[PDB]
Amino acid sequence: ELGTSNLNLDARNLLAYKQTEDLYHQLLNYPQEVISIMDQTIKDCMVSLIVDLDEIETKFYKVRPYNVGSCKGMRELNPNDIDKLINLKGLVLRSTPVIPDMKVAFFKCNVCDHTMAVEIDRGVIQEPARCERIDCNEPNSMSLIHNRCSFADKQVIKLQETPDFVPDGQTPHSISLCVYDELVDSCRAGDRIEVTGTFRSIPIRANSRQRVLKSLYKTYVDVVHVKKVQDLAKIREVAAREDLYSLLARSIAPSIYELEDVKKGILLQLFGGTNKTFTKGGRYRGDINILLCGDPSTSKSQILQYVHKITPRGVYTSGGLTAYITRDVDTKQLVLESGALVLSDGGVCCIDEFDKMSDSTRSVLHEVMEQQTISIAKAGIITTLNARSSILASANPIGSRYNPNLPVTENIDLPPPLLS
Amino acid sequence: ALPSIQLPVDYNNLFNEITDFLVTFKQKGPKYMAMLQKVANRELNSVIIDLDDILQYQNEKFLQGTQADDLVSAIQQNANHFTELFCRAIDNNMPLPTKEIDYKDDVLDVILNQRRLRNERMLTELFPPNLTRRYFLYFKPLSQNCARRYRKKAISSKPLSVRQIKGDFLGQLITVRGIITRVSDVKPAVEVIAYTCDQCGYEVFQEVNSRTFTPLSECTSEECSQNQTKGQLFMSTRASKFSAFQECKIQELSQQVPVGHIPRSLNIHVNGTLVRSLSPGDIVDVTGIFLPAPYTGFKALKAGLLTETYLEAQFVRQHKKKFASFSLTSDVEERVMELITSGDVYNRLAKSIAPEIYGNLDVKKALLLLLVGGVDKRVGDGMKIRGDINVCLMGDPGVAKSQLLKAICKISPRGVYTTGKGSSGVGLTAAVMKDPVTDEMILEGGALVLADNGICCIDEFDKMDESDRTAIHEVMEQQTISISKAGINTTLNARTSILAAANPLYGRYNPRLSPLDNINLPAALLSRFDILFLMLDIPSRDDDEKLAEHVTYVHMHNKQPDLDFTPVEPSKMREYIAYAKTKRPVMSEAVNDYVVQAYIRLRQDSKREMDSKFSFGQATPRTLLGIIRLSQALAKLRLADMVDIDDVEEALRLVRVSKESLY
Ligand SMILES: Nc1ncnc2c1ncn2[C@@H]1O[C@H](COP(=O)(O)OP(=O)(O)OP(=O)(O)O)[C@@H](O)[C@H]1O
Ligand SMILES: Nc1ncnc2c1ncn2[C@@H]1O[C@H](COP(=O)(O)OP(=O)(O)O)[C@@H](O)[C@H]1O
Ligand SMILES: [Mg+2]
Ligand SMILES: [Zn+2]
Ligand SMILES: [Zn+2]
């Protein structure tokens, strides 16, 4: 009734039956053929259960086994576990763009402009040495077309082990991944995922000029399933309460004693004002910017840490902050990279240790608040970036204590216009 | 062609004697049949051969005038040949399995049975024996006492240095000694490579012992041998036989290096079940076969006679020491019973750490309290608390604080010593950055050296630049380091105790306001530390006399003098620190009122911090938190699961003594 073609399968339920555990053992040893025959079985299950046959013929079917074996570690991978299904956890390091993969070769007899489709196997192409049209039968008239073939979307993912497997200060190890179709772009940098798939070993080419091969094989894994690691009525019931303001203000900092007014101010800043962009007059700022000052006996960093995670979007940094053209490490190209302040568009940007801001960056702030639009002109690139971000900053006084007699300006060591 | 020469060695008698030894040897019956029986039942995975047994068997059979030659001498002269002789002898004399076998799991044997039921049914190929083999063969160097048993000089062993190995030791069995530095990962190595023939009779096999490999093009299948092609042969991954491969390099010890030289290295190959038996950073005694390696892999067409050399491991003695993670044993149980009988322990422990440094009992007591750690494992509603204690030591140069730090690092297995630059890969960068030969850019991002449950020790705390200062400020209060450079955010969960020693820039204490000397560091960083000590050198007769007498008596005996009186030993402290950490007392509420009024009096002192000249008595909640942690550590060091008011009193006294050094 949905039209979706995807079947999840857990091994423990598959293990719950006595005839199925034999198929379990056979699947562990020989995954590919078992999966193919299972997919054919599911394909026939369409007609077996419907007895519209039009939506069935177009779609293929696949399974997603998981929880087959226990999660192992990259530090114990014997050669005895080649071409066997295993379960692995880890953290994604880097990705790669989609890699086309030939599936159907296209050839043309240029003399008579006759074309044919040639299926392939194991990558190697058996080229036809003479055209099928015996009316011409020329041997050397074939030249393939690169843009009229058919391709598959392969992608390679680099994965590292979890730090839990390293007890004595050793270094992590990285294992390559391969994905197809729906698993493309299913993860990005920094993801914590668990994968189940078979093991593969390949000989390396070494010298591309010759047919010599090394005595060692590269190891990589191919996976089939990946896992990660009407309420509006509930609002108006709460929103209609009279004392919701006080409870809402006090809820965002359960451990903070007193300091109610500053909590109300921070909560209201998180709520944010309106933003309007009337044409004949221009846009008006809608962001709210708050400073906190005092001696380092206030736990004022805790409030910043609270508000960084409470807000939907927000970057927590310290005393670089904006866009700079970077030189890519792994790949030899030049990529424009955005800064932390740009990444906090619509949210609240948290800044700690505001006094130690150097001098070059301060002017940057001086243009991100009064205009909320940063422009960069470097390496032939001239452009403007929207920021539209709120600022919540904290600073410390000069000396062991902030003397009440002395005014604020001297102790904080900030430019009077920026403070104003 | 090739001229021929005569040698006294013939392998027929050697093989016959090998078989006779393997069959008749009595050390349960024969031992060498027990190993073969366990191998047959798929129980044993590798076979170890002891040369002492061969030597003593030959010696004891020499009493009868039948034996004519010796085998161990030929073993020492050449080793690789006897490996295949031994494997052939084992394959010839493999007894039948006396135990049941889960036969369905051996997919290799199942595939071979399918191939045999294909071919022999028609009425077949004689497969190479090594493909059928499942065991590994290892040698063990003899022992010196066995050589001493007899007159002959069957010595071997003798763990030569790296540079002591010359060009005349190629092909022999030699033992080396050194420190392991680099260890690579585990990767499969091919032994027998199989191709499928596209359903054309037998599937061709091939074995390559070289470090390079070339594939086949055509096959000997009869219908494929027919004058037209029938299917392209393809390599089969399942049918092939593989083996674990690993490589490592070993460096010479600093004691064996001749003066004015640079230590050399040596490459070691290891295969089989011995893989992953060694770790970087240990002293080992490796015995193996010293083999040459061709230079043709580099493909330079130079060095017509020059070749590279490597050692193939055969037996490894890990040596060094074992931490054992205080695994409980009977003997250490009687040891802790003795400690229980010893009464009060921490004073003796303080007396017994660094007797070479005279006096300074309170500093050693603070070190003991640092070793156990404070209150930890979190509190309600997710608030973070760490058991780590941060202590900074102040004093003039020449007070043996650096030596005390070195002694602490020696006694603490997690201790690490760092300093401002000098070595770059110790702060803010991973130790594996740009390390692999492939330049894979392996990195965690923002991390320190073993900062997880480590004891970081630093000298010249004012020396470090802004980067290491930022790192030490980032590792504050178990805060993780989240410095990113290329999208990496694999943060290192830093939970470490910080111990640092520093000095004022004047090099001597000053009569003026002591905070003007401070650390020459920001006051925010100063307030983080739990305990501050100041060791000021006061010239006096009645103490410098004792110090000079102690130093000169140490110098006269060229050892730690008997003038020291310590009932407890460094390994005993190493055991007891883990034992007392295991006990882990928890907090008792009955001290809440007392600690609250103590904090009230601390703020009363804060009401007099403007009196100046020792203004360090400032107001900070971290003072109270450190008081709680120090009381918890005082309960932890000796007491059972209970925190006493005496712990609070001792923590207060320690704080007052810490402040009293200001004067
Ligand atoms: N109490 C002591 N007992 C014995 N020797 C001591 C003592 N105090 C200092 N020494 C001597 O001082 C030397 C070690 O102190 P050292 O000068 O290295 O420490 P430091 O105060 O950290 O100074 P620096 O920064 O100059 O290295 C040794 O030669 C040691 O014999
Ligand atoms: N009102 C308070 N409630 C709870 N803890 C507090 C309070 N005031 C201070 N503290 C404690 O004192 C410390 C103050 O540190 P903080 O001023 O945040 O340092 P910095 O501002 O330099 O980051 C906190 O770690 C906190 O544990
Ligand atoms: Mg020193
Ligand atoms: Zn044609
Ligand atoms: Zn064939």
User: Is the Cβ atom of A375 under 6 angstroms away from ligand 2?
Assistant: no
Residue in B124, B119, B147 with CA at minimum distance from that of residue B54: B147
Structural domain of B593: 329-658
Q: How far is Cα B646 from Cα B346, in angstroms, rounded to an integer?
A: 15
Q: How far is Cα B280 from Cα B247, in angstroms, rounded to an integer?
A: 12
Is B251 within 8 Å of B178 (Cβ atoms)? yes
User: Is the Cβ atom of A254 under 6 angstroms away from ligand 2?
Assistant: no
Nearest CA to ligand 1 atom 5: B357
Q: What are phi and psi of A178, to 5 degrees?
A: -135, 135
- The separation between CA A162 and the C-alpha centre of its own chain, rounded to angstroms, equals 17
Q: How far is Cα B154 from Cα B72, in angstroms, rounded to an integer?
A: 8
Burial B34-51 (b: 16+ CB within 10 A, else e): ebbbbbbeeebeebebeb
Q: How far is Cα A260 from Cα A209, in angstroms, rounded to an integer?
A: 74
Q: What are phi and psi of B410, to 5 degrees?
A: -65, -45
Which helix (H) or strand (E) segment holds residue B340: the answer is helix B330-341
Residue of A nearest to B449 (CA): A169
- Which B residues in the span 527-566 are in contact with A, Cβ-Cβ below 8 Å? 527
Question: DSSP H helical segments within B136-260, as ranges?
Answer: 144-149, 222-225
- The residue numbers preceding gaps of C to N over 2.5 A in chain B are 27, 123
- The answer to whether A215 contacts B442, with C-beta atoms less than 8 Å apart, is no
Resolution given for this structure, in angstroms:
3.9
Residue of A171, A331, A352 best to disrupt the B interface, most CBs of B under 10 A: A171
Is B571 within 8 Å of B353 (Cβ atoms)? no
Question: Which two three-digit tokens encode residue B238?
Answer: 């399942």
Which atom of ligand 1 lies at the shortest distance from residue B501's CA?
Answer: 22
Quick one: which ligand is closest to B201's CA? 5
User: Is the Cβ atom of B553 under 6 angstroms away from ligand 1?
Assistant: no
What is the 3 state secondary structure string of chain A? CCCCCCEEEEHHHHHCCCCHHHHHHHHHHCHHHHHHHHHHHHHHHHHHHHCCCCCCCCCCCCEEEECCCCEECCCCCCHHHCCCCEEEEEEEEECCCCEEEEEEEEEEECCCCEEEEEECECCECCCCCCCCCCCCCCCCCECCCCCCCEEEEEEEEEEECCHHHCCCCCCCCEEEEEEEHHHCCCCCCCCEEEEEEEEEEEECCCCCCCCCEECEEEEEEEEEEEEECCCHHHHHHHHCCCCHHHHHHHHCCCCCCCCHHHHHHHHHHHHCCCCECCCCCCCECCCCEEEEECCCCCCHHHHHHHHHHHCCCCCEEECCCCCEEEECCCCCCEEEECCHHHHCCCCEEEEECCCCCCCHHHHHHHHHHCCCEEEEEECCEEEEEECCCEEEEEECCCCCCCCCCCCHHHHHCCCHHHHC
Cβ-based contacts of B487 with chain A (< 8 Å): 94, 189-190
| Ligand 2 centroid to residue B521 C-alpha, Å | 20
Q: What's the CA angle centered on B146, arms B141 and B151, to 5 degrees?
A: 120
Contacts of A35 (CB under 8 A, 6+ apart): A27, A62, A63, A65, A224
Contacts of A189 (CB under 8 A, 6+ apart): A92, A93, A94, A95, B487
Cβ neighbourhood burial of A123 (10 Å; 0-12, 13-18, 19+): exposed
Is A43 within 8 Å of B208 (Cβ atoms)? no
Q: Which residue has the tokens 């690169």?
A: A146
Which DSSP category does B219 fall into?
-
CATH number of the domain within which B394 lies: 3.40.50.300
Which atom of ligand 1 lies at the shortest distance from residue B503's CA?
Answer: 25
Helix (H, G, I), strand (E, B), or coil: what is residue B242? strand
Question: Which two three-digit tokens encode residue B610?
Answer: 């403007």
Contacts of B46 (CB under 8 A, 6+ apart): B135, B136, B137, B138, B272, B273, B274
Which DSSP category does B175 fall into?
E
A363 in B contact zone (CB under 8 Å): no
| Ligand 2 centroid to residue B613 C-alpha, Å | 27
Residue in B514, B467, B528 with CA at minimum distance from that of residue B613: B514
Is B284 within 8 Å of B314 (Cβ atoms)? no
B394, B398, B402, B406: CA torsion to nearest 10 = -140
Q: How far is Cα B200 from Cα B219, in angstroms, rounded to an integer?
A: 9
Is A196 within 8 Å of A223 (Cβ atoms)? yes
Q: How far is Cα A334 from Cα A336, in angstroms, rounded to an integer?
A: 7
Helix (H, G, I), strand (E, B), or coil: what is residue B649? helix
Q: How far is Cα B654 from Cα B350, in angstroms, rounded to an integer?
A: 15
Q: How far is Cα B479 from Cα B492, in angstroms, rounded to an integer?
A: 9
User: Is the Cβ atom of B551 under 6 angstroms away from ligand 1?
Assistant: yes
Which approach determined this entry? cryo-EM
Q: Which candidate from B187, B432, B615 shows the least CB-CB separation from A216?
A: B187
Helix (H, G, I), strand (E, B), or coil: what is residue B377? coil
Q: How far is CA A360 from CA A176, A317, A322, A417, B345, in A?
A: 42, 17, 12, 16, 58
Question: Which two three-digit tokens encode residue A200?
Answer: 């593969």
User: Is the Cβ atom of B398 under 6 angstroms away from ligand 1?
Assistant: yes
Q: How far is Cα B607 from Cα B618, in angstroms, rounded to an integer?
A: 9
- The answer to whether B515 contacts A400, with C-beta atoms less than 8 Å apart, is yes
Quick one: which ligand is closest to A300's CA? 2
